[PDB]
Amino acid sequence: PTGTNMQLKNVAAVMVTASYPPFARQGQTIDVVVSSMGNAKSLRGGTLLMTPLKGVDSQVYALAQGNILVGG
Amino acid sequence: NGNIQVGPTGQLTIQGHPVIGEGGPITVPEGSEITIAADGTISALNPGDPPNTVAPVGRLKLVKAEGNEVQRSDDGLFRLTAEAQAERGAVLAADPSIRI
Amino acid sequence: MISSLWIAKTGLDAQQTNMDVIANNLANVSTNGFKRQRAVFEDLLYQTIRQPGAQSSEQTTLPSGLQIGTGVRPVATERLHSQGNLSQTNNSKDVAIKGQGFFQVMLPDGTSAYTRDGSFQVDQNGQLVTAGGFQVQPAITIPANALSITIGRDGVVSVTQQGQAAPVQVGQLNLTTFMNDTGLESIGENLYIETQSSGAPNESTPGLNGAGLLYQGYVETSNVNVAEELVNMIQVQRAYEINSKAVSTTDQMLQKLTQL
Amino acid sequence: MISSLWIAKTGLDAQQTNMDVIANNLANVSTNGFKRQRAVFEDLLYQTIRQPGLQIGTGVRPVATERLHSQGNLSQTNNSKDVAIKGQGFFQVMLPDGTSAYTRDGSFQVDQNGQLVTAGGFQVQPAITIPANALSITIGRDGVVSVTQQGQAAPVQVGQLNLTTFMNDTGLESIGENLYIETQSSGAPNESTPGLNGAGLLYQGYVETSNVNVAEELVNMIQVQRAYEINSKAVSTTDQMLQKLTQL
Amino acid sequence: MISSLWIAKTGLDAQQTNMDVIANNLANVSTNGFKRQRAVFEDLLYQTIRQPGAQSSEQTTLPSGLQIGTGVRPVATERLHSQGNLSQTNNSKDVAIKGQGFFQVMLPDGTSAYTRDGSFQVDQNGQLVTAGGFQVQPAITIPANALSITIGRDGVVSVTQQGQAAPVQVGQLNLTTFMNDTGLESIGENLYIETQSSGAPNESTPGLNGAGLLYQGYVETSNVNVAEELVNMIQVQRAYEINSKAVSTTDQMLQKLTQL
Amino acid sequence: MISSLWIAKTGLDAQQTNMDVIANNLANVSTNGFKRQRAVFEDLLYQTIRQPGAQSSEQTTLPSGLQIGTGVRPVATERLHSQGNLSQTNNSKDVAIKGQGFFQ
């Protein structure tokens, strides 16, 4: 429902950045960097949900989803 | 000693010794108001935020031990005697019947 | 030194402020174009101690925990901008407003003030001024040999000279209306000035989109209801009694602690 | 040390808290839409002594104050902008920082650009924009704010004054200036039109006065003073007993 | 903190409840179709201590032991449903009930309340409504060009049109009667809502089954007898003073206990 | 501070309103085409300390509980539109209405 209070603690909004390599072909995999965006304490053992990586032209060039590795 | 004091980093210390909770030593969000509960539940409120965001961050580990099972150490803190250690383990299990 | 004494002191000060407002309202009964004032109070802060809604126990929460309040403090005094009852003084220069408009005058400093009182006179130079000598905008000039001054419902000031069957128009009295009428700053002397909470002065003709109608020979008396003031005086006296009793009780308690 | 000084001290502190609550109730006897507070005292832990059965107390501690949400009396303001609530309901008012508080003080004003605000200047949800050339503002029983303009023979609908109802009215946090914020103990602010779903009605030209009864406060002050004297006497007796002990 | 003080507290508050009942009766003297209220009080608890009837000395019982009682609590306020004096106002729309009936009115939220005030008005659509804008049931609609409205004592409503020498019946005004008229819950605005202690609404036309007869041009004034209210003032004041005297005596006793 | 005081305060305002209505009616005796006013009052709030009809026990119900009332409020001030007495001024420009019409 539109009018409701959700107060989550296990979810963080993040920005994912990656490099599109030369001569990249569909189906190949690349590394991504996940950075928190607002008042999150940690991203220790989180899992990145399906994220479309846009280019400068605002077109989806990659789809990101995986487990984050934080140093510790 | 229940005189619990917070730190700038937000960890709970009693006489300089960090307080032990169910997740180990208790770390509380920095600059928050704390309300310990009748069962040791720690609720943290961020100043400025509405009272709708009061969310627990941990639980104090409260244990029950009679005077026969504890001996005083040289630093003022009590610890289980050897017999009581072999009877109830090195690490005491928290008793849920303890009120605070 | 003790909390209850500060709280009761704040209560006493609030009741004294209420009595001051009542006395000011009763002192201006005979003032024309006066609006009675009413003060509104608020409580002050609230000591947190035990945050309500906290986890009382792992599965339960504290319902309505321990909040300790401080005293009281007055928010603001609002005027009651309502048409004061009219009175016939049978004077060609007295003007009363039937609606929601104001007259504009110029202070000696050059700024513009606004007054609802319509007791007007003429100066030695022939301009229409108020009782304090302030020149009423828009500066209606009455000529030397006037026989009668007629101010109509729509604000036209006309002078009938000798031997002329037609009246000579010598000005046009307009009314200024504000979005927030209570937000004006009263400087005394029946004068209100524009503040940023009173919007902007909208000039309008007396009879148009909401300016009031001008009545000649009438004065708008104050809207102070006196029986209400007497009852409120009784109420204020009793409240001050009770607050003083709270102060005295706190005084008696600290005495026993001193004796300890 | 181990004695009765602390028992008596915890007792005095309780009487001090009760007196603070009474003084707060009395100071806000003129505020519009004020709910009186009552402090609840409920004793501390007990120490059990085992025989070869008996339990000694420790004192008393304040737990939580409850605000009495009964409908206060209505008084007259003949001001068209003031509305009182008949029943259970709260006006929603938007604070400058962005979070919405809830108030019952129905003394409102129109600010410099239209807009209905409380006495403190905070804007009142749902936002109303009163036209400048308004001749009379009429707020209906069901919260419809209609505005009359010169010429048109029909009033113009401007806005609806919705009431926010909480299932537990006592758990709201009193933030200070006649405003409450929702809390975990008073969650789910239910917005409704006044008159339906348990919401209260609106009386225009009336303001809801405070709920503070006077006789209760005065007699409670008498009780607090006398109990404070009793606890002070107990403190003095413990002091004399310890003095006699130390002189040995 | 002491028993006598709690007993005296019930006393003061209950004489105030009386005082509130008296003030409410007085404020509604001019209200049409108002019924005066009277409060009933009962004894509070009685501590057993020595049990009356318990056998002492094996063959002798103990009569009337220590039944130490607590204060007083008001049972309930009951309305005096009696016929108020009829006042003639010479209006086609005022209807007065002379018996024991109620008019039925529909609240816009869907439910129906019951009112005795007979000052009726006509909305812009021609319906017979209450002065608060609530639409009477059944539902009397009045034609546009009505010359005279006649409400008979049987509740029939007739309208005299132009060009028609015979009136046309446009409705039938019924009266609602209840098993217990004191059990209706007063919601203000001269309106009663049905409760489970007031039985169920019994519809009856005026003149049969007991419903009263409807008079046109008359209003049923309030039944408040005011000299009785003044005499009740004098008691509600003396009783409150005496209870406050008891409070003061207990206060002095406690003070001397503390001071020693 | 006391509820009885507020109830009396309202009652005083209501009676002052009645007095003002009477004074206004008397002030307009000689004016032509006047309709005298009349004020209507209604019950204010009703404090339900004990609910009338509350189920005190599984068998008995409390009749007519503690309904402590507040003061009074004037519903409105309605004008009595009735035909006033006609008087002959004997001027050609004076007109009178016999029914329920209005000049525009």
**Which residue of chain D is at minimal alpha-carbon distance from E111?**
D196
Omega cis (within 30) before D126: yes
**Which residue of chain B is at minimal alpha-carbon distance from D184?**
B52
**Phi and psi dihedrals of E159, rounded to 5?**
-125, 130
Give the integer Cα–Cα distance in Å for C154 and C140.
Answer: 15
**What DSSP designation does D16 have?**
H
C-alpha separations of E151 from C81, E154, E213, E215 in Å? 44, 8, 11, 8
Contact D226 E108 (CB under 8 A): no
C-alpha separations of D247 from D6, D216, D237, D241, D244 in Å? 22, 47, 16, 10, 6
Three-state secondary structure call for residue A55:
coil
Q: Which amino acid is at E93?
A: K
Q: How many CB atoms lie within 10 A of CB C12?
A: 20
Minimal CA separation from B99 to chain D, in Å: 9
Three state DSSP letters for chain E: CCHHHHHHHHHHHHHHHHHHHHHHHHHCCCCCCCCCEEEEEEECCEECCCCCCCEECCCEECCCCCCEECCEEEEEEEECCCCCCEEECCCCCEEEECCCCEEEEECCCCCEEEECCCEEEECCCCEEEECCCCEEECCCECCCCCCEEEECCCCEEEEECCCCCCCEEEEECCEEECCCCCCCEECCCCCEECCHHHCCCEEECCCCCCCCCEEECEEECCCCCHHHHHHHHHHHHHHHHHHHHHHHHHHHHHHHHHHC
Q: How many CB atoms lie within 10 A of CB A46?
A: 17
Question: Cβ neighbours of residue E187 under 8 Å, at least 6 residues apart?
Answer: E113, E193, F46
Give the integer Cα–Cα distance in Å for D107 and D207.
Answer: 7
Residue that has been written with the tokens 């049931």 in this structure: E137
The token duo for C131 is 């009782």
Looking at the DSSP bridge assignments, the partners of residue E74 are E41
Give the integer Cα–Cα distance in Å for C239 and C245.
Answer: 10
Contact E132 F75 (CB under 8 A): yes
Contact E5 D142 (CB under 8 A): no
Contact D214 F1 (CB under 8 A): yes
* Rg (alpha carbons) of chain D, rounded to whole number: 25
F4 Cβ under 8 Å from any chain C Cβ: no
Helix (H) or strand (E) holding D11: helix D5-27
Give the integer Cα–Cα distance in Å for B44 and B37.
Answer: 11
Give the integer Cα–Cα distance in Å for D35 and D102.
Answer: 14
CA atoms within 13 A on the CB side of E34: 26
The technique by which this structure was obtained is cryo-EM
Question: Cβ neighbours of residue F68 under 8 Å, at least 6 residues apart?
Answer: E17, E20, E21, E24, E77, F3, F46, F47, F49
- E77 interaction partners in chain F (CB closer than 8 Å): 64-68
**Which residue of chain F is at minimal alpha-carbon distance from C234?**
F5
Q: Which of F43, F53, F80 sits opposite E188 (nearest CB)?
A: F43
**In this complex, does chain E touch chain A, defined as having at least 3 beta-carbon pairs under 8 Å apart?**
no
Helix (H) or strand (E) holding D228: helix D214-246
Residue E98 CB-density burial (10 A; 0-12 exposed, 13-18 middle, 19+ buried): middle
F101 Cβ under 8 Å from any chain E Cβ: no
F5 Cβ under 8 Å from any chain C Cβ: yes
B51 Cβ under 8 Å from any chain D Cβ: yes
Residue that has been written with the tokens 């802060």 in this structure: C45
**188-207 in E: which are within 8 Å (CB) of F?**
188-190, 195-198
Angle subtended at Cα D29 by Cα C80 and Cα C71, rounded to the nearest 5 degrees: 105
Omega cis (within 30) before C138: yes
Give the integer Cα–Cα distance in Å for C213 and E98.
Answer: 49
Give the integer Cα–Cα distance in Å for C155 and C174.
Answer: 6
Residue D96 CB-density burial (10 A; 0-12 exposed, 13-18 middle, 19+ buried): exposed
D97 Cβ under 8 Å from any chain B Cβ: yes
The answer to whether the CB of F54 falls within 8 A of the CB of F61 is yes
Contact B43 C58 (CB under 8 A): no
Contact F76 E186 (CB under 8 A): no
Contact D75 F2 (CB under 8 A): no
E50 Cβ under 8 Å from any chain D Cβ: no
Q: Which amino acid is at E60?
A: T
Q: Where are the beta strands (DSSP E) in D68-192?
A: 74-76, 83-86, 90-94, 100-103, 108-111, 114-118, 123-125, 134-139, 144-149, 156-160, 163-165, 173-174, 180-181, 190-192
Give the integer Cα–Cα distance in Å for C103 and C201.
Answer: 11
Three-state secondary structure call for residue D241:
helix
C-alpha separations of E139 from A57, E126, E201 in Å? 69, 10, 17
**What DSSP designation does D231 have?**
H
**39-68 in A: which are within 8 Å (CB) of B?**
41
**Phi and psi dihedrals of C19, rounded to 5?**
-65, -40
Give the integer Cα–Cα distance in Å for C251 and D37.
Answer: 23
